[PDB]
Structures are given as structure tokens and as C-alpha cells.
């Protein structure tokens, strides 16, 4: 099982595994009228985004029906670079003009539901480095092989601190059946539109874990598969942000578990100097505000 | 306040500060009949323990009435090295022979209450490197200057991952008034015996945060002071243990907050190789079992 795993392998809930034998052509044939959107959330990702798009471009009008970059207020060259590589770029405003924007990653993913039309939506972060072209096929695989899977999470080898110290231990504590999930915070995952538009979306960095727990709570572990992506490189998230990320993962998880979170942000005390003679006090915002199911806003 | 702080400085709850002007002699005079124990919990600390003891030895029979190493089942030379440096060594068994031993740090600190007699107890970890001789005087300071302080936590400049990503964000969420606590997990702190023997002790790595929250819940923030220790070096805790530590901090904190923790330990999935072709599954134990107030077991 986890003693012999090759990129593409699928772990189902009942501890059973599957090693896919389809070609991308064969996968495309298995769509059976269903459509697939790929969504790349992006915020100031000009160095890496073209490369990510390039790894997926070759599928467009084949396995992948549409490829969308959801631009979350970039001020660098993210937009023009994405267009040049052949992706459709949609801003937060364009995705859903009739709702004011809130900050954070979750907002962008939620808005991408309104911008996309695929019966299946695959999310891929636009800060991946050298992403394997099979990422998307591997993620859609368990969805097209009809066995009641609605959400496909990925796992991978880092060529993790908030995952290993915050998300996974808090899941053991509060949703222990989800202890089998190797990468609960991972930005590479696929789900059915029917699932995605039926659940609230957590704000900021709470989005991935929010979706995992909501899916589990509503459909059980059987609706969730995990796919080995193998080695996955990406850009380093800055170390300063990790406390804020942890705080938001906690807020989201507590809220899903029915535990009142204070809504008070993390105050970090940053030493001004090596002697620890003064500290700068930096309070990061945290949000308890989900977005409602997209079916409540822009229903199909 | 935190804009100009020198080792020794005390932050009280009402955001007020104090810069101590006493000599160690003057502090000793202020004891007014009260006694002071220093307790060094130790587990396989033969390289560092003599040095720690040496930093405190000069106070014994003066400010410090007794210095005890609580040996938690060392199999290296911790015991003989501590004796050679002039500390009294007490095993878990010797401290409280009539109660079976449970594993973990909290057990050792709890048992040290039975082994010690001081009206004030100061805890100092035996894996400090080059600890400043004033650590103990600085920690006892706010206790001897009678203003309703019962627990003195320290803060310091690291010359932190579970503190910064787990303990402090979870405190913001569940006990936001404790957001002002810079180092909630720190092993250097002092408290009155009346407090220490009146509260349950959390197991394993939950002990420090358990005491902080119990004190806050019972006596409010006014009973808690923080003292700047300045730069504090210690030995690196191995990286593999951090998930288990986080899991226990979570269990302890949830339990104090009235939230049912599943009691399921963290399962870590450790890649066997760089390709992520197999994973080793390692499940760390977690405990939900406090020890009762020592007053219920070996009352004074």
C-alpha cells in the first residue's frame, strides 16, 4: 500500500489502493460528456505561472475543457505572462462582479466556481516548480473511474511545518478518521462541481482544510481519495507568514468542529535585535467568515 | 515597555512593567521566612546538567534553600554528574514511591512537588547552555515583591516552532487574554507551592501550558508575571519529536478549554526515500490523563 507507491497511485477510504492503467486518451474517453476545468489561483506569481500553465496547455480541448487563472489582485506581471502561455485570466471582480471582494486565498477559489463551468474542477497552485504534466490526469483519474469519489486530495514528497505541526495534529484531535490524509493543506486537488457549490468556502488559508472537513462531514471518508503526485517542488512560503497561516487553519478547523473561536488574531512578538531588548508587536488578521455555498449566489 | 527591555524586567498583567533594583542579598532578605526550591527535571542530560547546576550552586543555603534534580529515568551519566556538581538527585520513584510511574515530563514535574519543600518552587530545564546565574533570582523576584503574583513565566531571545505555530495561535483562539504570553511552553518559571499543589498537572509535554491555563482560569491574568531572561541558549530538540509535542500541547489545551479531544495519537507518514515510493507509519502516543492536585495525594 504505502509500502510500494508510484506517482498516480490512488488510496481509497477502505484502505484499498489502485494503480491507474489508463492513457490520457483513455481518460479523455471516460469523461462521458462530463467537462473538466482547471483553475490556477494566482497572486504575484510571474516567475512560476507560465511554467505551470505549460505543464497543462497540451490537454486543453482534450482532457481539459478550460484552463483558468484566477488572479487575486496581482501587481506584478502574472496576468500578461499567463495570457502569453495560453491561459484565460479572470480577476476576482470579473468572476463575480455583484459581490464585494474579501481578501485571502479562499475568496479566490470560491469566486473561481462562478468563473468556471466544468462538471469537475481541478485546482493547482501557480507557485509549483517543474510540475509533472500528469498532475491533472492523476487528480481527475479517481473522479472519472466512477466509484463514489467526490474529492481527490494529493500527497507528495517534499524535495510542511503548518501541515505537520498544526493541521495534522489538530485533525487527529478533532476529526481522527481524517488522520489518514497525508497532505490536508495541499493546493493540488480535484472535486465535482456538485460538491464544490454545495459547501461554504473557508476564508484565506483555511480553504483547503475547510473543504476536506466539509466533504468528510457530509459524505464520509468514502467520498475522498488521495493520489500520489510523487516529488512536488514549489516556491518557499515566507517564514514570517506561517504563524498567521496556522492561526487561520485553527480558526477554520475549530469553526467546522462546532467550537467557538475567539476571532482574535495572532499577535507575534518579533525581536528587534539579537539581544532581545525590544520587540515589535505584529497582529495578523484572522477570519471566521465563510462564503456561503455558491449555489446560494450564482446557481447553475 | 517591550520597546526598552533589559534582562530582569517584569511585565505585569495590567501592561505595567518593573525593572528590579535589588541585589541577590536584598532578594534573600525579602524572603521573610518563605523558602525556595529549585527543581531541574532531567532525562539523559549528562553533557549539560553540571553546567546548569553550576550556574545555581552559589545560591544554595542563601537565596535557594534546596536544589533538586528530578531524574526521569536517565540511563546515561546524568545522575552521577549532578551529584558531582552538588545537586540532590531524586528519581521519580523516590519522589513518590506509593504511586506508579507514568511516562512524560509532566509526571516528573508533578512528582517534584512531593520531593521538594520550598514555599516557592523554581523550574529550570537541565538542557540549557550557558544559563545566566541570575535566571533563578530574576524568576523569584516578582514572587518576593508581594503584589499577588503566583506564577512567573519567562521570555527570552532565541540565540520555537511548536510555540510560534501551535501554542500561541491556539491560545489566541481559545484563551485570547493569554495572547500577551511570549513563551507559554517555556521550561523556566516559578510558582508558589499553594498554587502548584492545588492544580492538576498535565502529562508529557502538556505540563507548562496546562499550568499557565489553569492559573489563568483560577486566578486571572493578574496572578501571572513575565520576566525577561535575555538571550537563552539550549540544546536542539530533535525535529522528529515536534509533531508529538504539538499533538500533546493540543490535547492539554483542548482539555483545559472543555473541548473533547479524541485521544487518538498523531500518525506521521515518514517518506522512506527521496522519491516518496514508500512511507513508514509512526503513531506517537498522546495522553488525556492529568495527575490530580498534589494536595489530594501527599498533602502538606
Keywords:
homodimer; 300 residues; Spore Coat Polysaccharide Biosynthesis Protein SpsA, Chain A; 9-stranded mixed β-sheet; two-stranded antiparallel sheet; Glucosyl-3-phosphoglycerate synthase (chains A, B); transferase (chains A, B); Glycosyltransferase_2 (chains A, B); Nucleotide-diphossugar_trans (chains A, B); metal-binding (chains A, B)
What Rg of chain A, in angstroms, do the CA atoms define? Answer: 19 Å
Identify the CATH architecture of chain A. Alpha-Beta Complex
Number of helices of chain A: 10
Biggest interface pair, counts:
A-B, 53 and 53 residues
Helix content of chain A: 25-40%
Which quaternary structure do these chains form?
Answer: homodimer
The CATH topology label of chain A is: Spore Coat Polysaccharide Biosynthesis Protein SpsA, Chain A
Strand order of the largest sheet of chain A: 2-1-10-8-9-6-3-4-5
Count of DSSP strands of chain A: 13
The total tally of domains of chain A equals 1
**Biggest beta-sheet profile of chain A:** 9 strands, mixed
Q: Which range does the strand content of chain A fall in?
A: 15-25%
Shape of chain A: globular
CATH level-4 homologous superfamily of chain A: Spore Coat Polysaccharide Biosynthesis Protein SpsA, Chain A
CATH class of chain A: Alpha Beta
Structural class of the helices, strands and pairings of chain A? alpha/beta
The rounded distance between the terminal residues' Cα atoms of chain A is 39 Å
**Order of H and E elements of chain A:** EEHEHEHEHHEEHEHEHHEEHEE
PDB class: unknown function
Keywords: mycobacteria, unknown function
Assembly: dimeric
Entry title: Crystal Structure of a Mycobacterial Protein
